[PDB]
Each structure stands twice: as C-alpha cells, then as structure tokens.
C-alpha cells in the first residue's frame, strides 16, 4: 500500500462509536464482570487454572461503510474512557471490613488498562509466567510451551480474532508486528495499589504515525481491542476476584486513496 | 449551525457560585458526612440506607434573557474545593493512629468530579452489584439485569435533581454530553492520601476542537459536581464519607446560531 491523498467533501468522513464489555471470567450470572475466586496452586508443575478465573482480551470487529464499486478508511482520532468508574465506591456489598466496624475493602491491587485501534486484528506475542501452567480448553494460549517461553519464544504468535478466548496473562501486543495498529497499555502491579481512573469527554488521542498516516481498515473493518482489569474485590471470606469495567471507543475515520 | 461571537461591553457575562456536597447527612450534627457504612451479608441482601449514599450535586443557573437568535456560550471555568484545610481537624472524635497518637485523618477512596454544560449532565448506569436495592427517594438504574454490572444501555438518565442520583450508580454517559464538558478522577484504595491543590491562577478552557463551548439552551447554565474527599474513621472504628463544597466561576459570551 503506497498511501496517497486524503478525500475531502461532506461524505469523505465517518464516525464509529461503541463499548466493549469486559471478559473477567464470569463464574456465575450474579458475578458478571468479575473473575472466579483465585486458587493458588501447590507447585509450578501442578498449576491448572479454571477457565472462569482467567480474564481475557476483549475485541470488536466493526464493519465500516462499503467503499469499492482504491479507497480505504483511515482511523485519525480516538476518544476512549472506562464506563462505571464510580461503581468502585460500592463498599457496602459483601466485602471484607478494613477493621472492626469498618467499611468494606474497596477494589484495589494489580490492574491492567489497555486499548488498541487498528485496520486488522491485534497481533499477539506469547509470554508465560510459568511455562508448565495448563491453560484450559476453550481458551487460545501459547502451544508447545518450552522453558524459553517464560522470557521469549517466537513460536507463540497469534491474532486477537475472538472474544472470551485469549487470556490476558499469556498474551501481549507483538512489538515486531502491529504496523497497522496503535496500542496503549499500563500494568500497575502490587497487592494494595490504588486504582487511579480519569474520565473526561475533552481528551482526544491522534492515531496518525510520524508520516501522518493512521491505521488503514483492510476489508472496510475497524478492529477495537481492550482490557480493563481495575483490580481485585476481597469478599467477607477473604477470597479475591478480578473486577473489570467496559470501555467506550469513538473513532473518527476519513477516506484515503492507496495504490 | 454556530456563527459569529458578539463583541462589545454587554457581549460577556460571569456566573459565580458554590455547590454544597450531598454526602447523605445522617443527622444535622453530621452535615457533609455520610452515615457510617454497613457491609451486607450477601450480594442478594444489599439494601443500603439513603443517608449512606453520596449523590451528584447539580445547580441550574438562569443567565440574562437574550432572544436574530443568540445563546450564552461557556468559554472558561475556574473551580476549586472549598475547605481543604478542614481535613487537618485530627482532634475531633477520631480513632487514634496508635497509643497516645493523633486522630486518623480523612483518607481512602475519593471521587472529585465537576461538569459545565448548556443542558443537564447525561448519565449512564453501571452497578457494582445488580441486586443492590437502592432506596425510595433516590433515582437509580430501573429493571437492573445481570448485564447492568458491566453495561446496560437501558440505564440512561439526566442529572436534573439534587440528593437523588447516587454517585455509585451513575457516570457521565460518553455516548451523549456533546453540549457538556466533564472532568472526573476516582482515586480508590483504603489508605489513599487526599491530594487537594487550591489556586485562583488556574483556568480551564471549555471550547471544543472547533472553538465552540457549551451553548446554554433556554438561557440556563448547568453546573454539576461530586467531591467525596475520602472517609472519616471515628473512635468506634466505623467509617463515613466526608465531602466538601466546590466553587465555580464561568465566563460566558453571546453567540449567534441558526434554526
């Protein structure tokens, strides 16, 4: 694709607006947007987690207006925010008291907030904390895990092309690919880490590269991808579950001629 | 269709007011505090007391009568939290940090939020626990389903009343609010330090990327705020939300529009 001039005019520009619900594991309907309580394995050798215990990458493939009868939709600007940040102030619902007579323990600890806009499926690289971890039937995970899978194994390449499938802890955006995607992610690890969530409708991310070219939507398809593990909920018994929230996306696209 | 800005002596006006916090106000002695927080036994039996739920504050300020067709356009905001130094009262009915120690200062989960708009702030509902029973006198997500815990598009509302919209049910709807600028930060966690800056030298510009600010329909400016500063632990160990008032100063100018 040799990129040429941008189309101008009333009909040269379009907008895509949607939300991605979180895939935290959903152990029963009462706990939608939570993971299952986290079990710790006895040894590295015998680590076989339940499927509803593994948060997954969320993905949306949004069809854009048909262009052919050579134009492509170019993603220019993104607006995004986490939906329902104030829900984390429910500190009265089945929590563990901070101390005697105290309010509930609020959602806190390890968090991963991540969003991507691209003209093709997000490209993943596999890295495993423990290579002998047995990921469950129904998830897509690094196959033929060797000892070198714990630092870097180039065999573990995949496309984020399915929901409730790619576990967060196996997969990261592949920095060797993703030429046609813009991705942003922050892991704030630790056990007592405060969530810091900003909301505003005044903040815009520009998706153009150093050459002034944004993601080009192949087959007139925009690929939105997100993870928002806000932290962990401690319930009365002391058990801890991941809690996640949906993510709003608004993408401005424009028609671009290519050769 | 937005056209030229009016100039001249009489082309510009100013709105200055404070919004008191609605923290719950369990008795007159505790104005600007919530009731002590009860933790429920299960998710299914969570029925909080009305005076335990902080609420969005809102002010609808009439502007000079105008109206070929002029509207007041909000250009610049100055805002700050009033009474930040009150959180140094560490000698009044608190729980000692340790033996012979000073009181425990207000700390933990905080949500600071302010909005300026030409119409009521538009709200989206997200529930921590969908089976939470919100009390008569509050306005909350009706017909809560399982999907209400992540995203249910049925839960749309207007912040059109005081002491009514609980903070933990409602967030600004990012799908609407074209005619509002909103800013919010949740700093969750149990021991989180409040960080409150005050200055009369800081100005927020409310103009969008096209140089257009919020247009006040019916000559009405809509100010909205939440300032849950954290929690007060009293001698017994029980914890109450503490909030503070918010100053607003909005500079508006006359703008001609069409239709």
């Amino acid at each position, epitope marked *: 694709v040799e990129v040429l001039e941008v189309k101008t005019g009333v009909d040269s520009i379009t907008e895509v607006e949607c939300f991605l619900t979180p895939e935290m594991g959903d152990p029963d309907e009462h706990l939608r947007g939570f993971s299952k309580s986290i079990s710790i394995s006895d040894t590295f050798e015998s680590d076989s987690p339940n499927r509803d215990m593994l948060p997954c990458y969320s993905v949306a493939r949004i069809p854009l207006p048909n262009l052919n009868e050579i134009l492509m939709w170019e993603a220019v600007t993104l607006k995004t925010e986490v939906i329902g940040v104030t829900s984390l102030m429910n500190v009265h619902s089945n929590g563990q008291a901070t101390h005697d007579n105290g309010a509930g323990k609020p959602v806190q600890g390890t968090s991963f907030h991540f969003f991507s806009v691209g003209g093709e499926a997000l490209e993943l690289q596999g890295v495993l904390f423990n290579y002998r971890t047995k990921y469950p039937d129904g998830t897509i995970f690094p196959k033929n895990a060797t000892v070198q899978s714990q630092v870097m194994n180039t065999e573990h390449k995949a496309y984020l092309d399915k929901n409730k499938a790619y576990p967060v802890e196996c997969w990261v955006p592949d920095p060797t690919r993703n030429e046609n995607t813009r991705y942003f992610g922050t892991l704030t690890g630790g056990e007592n880490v405060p969530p810091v969530l900003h909301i505003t409708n005044t903040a815009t991310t520009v998706l153009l590269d150093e050459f002034g070219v944004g993601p080009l939507c192949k087959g007139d398809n925009l690929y939105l991808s997100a993870v928002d593990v806000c932290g962990m909920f401690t319930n009365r018994s002391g058990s801890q579950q991941w809690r996640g929230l949906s993510r709003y996306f608004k993408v401005q696209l424009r028609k671009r001629r290519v050769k | 269709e937005v056209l030229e800005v009016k100039t001249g002596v009489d082309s510009i006006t100013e709105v200055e007011c404070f919004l008191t916090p609605e923290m719950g106000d369990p008795d007159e002695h505790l104005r600007g505090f919530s009731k002590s927080i009860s933790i429920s036994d299960t998710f299914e039996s969570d029925s909080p007391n009305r005076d335990m739920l902080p609420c969005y504050s809102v002010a609808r300020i009439p502007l000079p009568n105008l109206n070929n067709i002029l509207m007041w356009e909000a250009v610049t905001l100055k805002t700050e939290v009033i009474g930040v130094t009150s959180l140094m009262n560490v000698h009044s009915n608190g729980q000692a940090t340790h033996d012979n120690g000073a009181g425990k200062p207000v700390q933990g989960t905080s949500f600071h939020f302010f909005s300026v708009g030409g119409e009521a702030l538009e709200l989206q509902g997200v529930l921590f626990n969908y089976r939470t029973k919100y009390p008569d006198g509050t306005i909350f997500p009706k017909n809560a389903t*399982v999907q209400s815990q992540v995203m249910n598009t049925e839960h749309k509302a207007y912040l059109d009343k005081n002491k009514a919209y609980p903070v933990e049910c409602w967030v600004p709807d990012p799908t609407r609010n074209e005619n509002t600028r909103y800013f919010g930060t949740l700093t969750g966690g149990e021991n989180v330090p409040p960080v409150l800056h005050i200055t009369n030298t800081a100005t927020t510009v409310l103009l969008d990327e096209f140089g257009v600010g919020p247009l006040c329909k019916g000559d009405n400016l809509y100010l909205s705020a939440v300032d849950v500063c954290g929690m007060f632990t009293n001698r017994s160990g029980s914890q109450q939300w503490r909030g503070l008032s918010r100053y607003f100063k909005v500079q508006l100018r006359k703008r001609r529009v069409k239709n």
Partner: single-chain antibody
Amino acid sequence: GSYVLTQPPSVSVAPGKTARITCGGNNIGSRSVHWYQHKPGQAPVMIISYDMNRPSGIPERVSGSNYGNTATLTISRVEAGDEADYYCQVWDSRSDHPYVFGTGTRVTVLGSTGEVQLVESGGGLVKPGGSLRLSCAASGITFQYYAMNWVRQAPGKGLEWVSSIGGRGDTTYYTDSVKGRFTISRDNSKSTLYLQMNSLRAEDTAVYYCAKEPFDSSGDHRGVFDYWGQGTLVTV
C-alpha cells in the same frame, strides 16, 4: 472415530486408605479433564473441573491431576459415602463427537458398607417406533446464558452424551446414533429444555439426565456439566 477415554472398570479400597481412578487418553494431558461422581438413583455431581479444581462443597480429600497419556482422580481418606461410579470427561469443540465420557470406574469400600434446580418430566413406557417428549424445568437461573445438554445411562452401560444446545438455541449437536430421530430445543421465557425423541429404538432405554454448563455471556458451550437433574427412565 471419537476421542477415546479408557477407565479401569472397578477399584477396591479399605476405609482410610486412598483410592486412585485413572483416565487413560491419547495425549489427554493437553486436554481439560472433568470428573463426575454418580450414586445409583441420584443426580451426578461434578467433583473436579479443569484437571484439579474443586467446586464449593467437595472436600480437600478429593484431588485431580492430568499429565501424560493418563489423568488421575484421588480420594484420600475414603468413607462409606465415597462408594459410587466415577467418570472422567473431555470436550472437543469442533469435532463429530464433542462431549466424550470415560467408560466409568465403580469404587467399592470393603470394610462394612439449592439456588439452581433442574426438575425433569416426560419419561415412561413407550413401544418401538413410538415418540416421547422429555422436558427439564430450570429455576434460579436466567436460562438464555447457559448451554444445556441431554446425557443418558442405559441399564448396565455408563454415561453417554446424547445432545447439546446453545443458550440462544443457535447451536445444536447430537450423537451419531440419534441424528435424524432426536430434536433438542428451548423455551428461555418458560425457562425449560426439551428433547423430542421420536422413531424410538430398543437401545434408547436409559435414565435421561438434564445437564447444565457454567454461565456464559453468549450462552456458548464450555465443555463441562457443573449441575445435573435427578434423571428420568425411558423403557421400550
């Protein structure tokens, strides 16, 4: 053919001693294995999911592993109560036999021998070539978010998966031995699962069990039966 799970027909242990039920499978170690306990007359309970995970209720005594060409259930401090049939089960999404059960292991002890409900109807006597409608009335769950299944146990034989349906009724799968004859369906509003069994043969006589899968936002298949109905016997 199908994937094959081989189990020892029977195992004997004294009270206190530990019991080991093996589940042999061609590279079973790279598949998630689930274990079901079944006492005669009662609803099967899931005791292990995803190789080694214990549901609320099942004690620490019960233990699961899965490594080589063999997965292993281990009941450690054995009691009279532990006497039952134990089945291992795997899931092969996208194959002609998606839900595969082991042949079953009967454990004998040689010392001195309620939010979710699934209520079943429709069973009884019917003649060869005749019809019959099984129903399973769920309560306490939003039905459309749960893939549902029919499993049967012929007199003498072990558990055999019969049919599976998605939460929205989108996906339908059958065993090769019932393809053109049995039809599975749902009424999410009435919150019940149906099996329309017509053109019935003699080898269909079995206790028909209603089997629920774990919650899924789409009502997708997950390959585990986390709760069972008490079962209904069809004879011919």
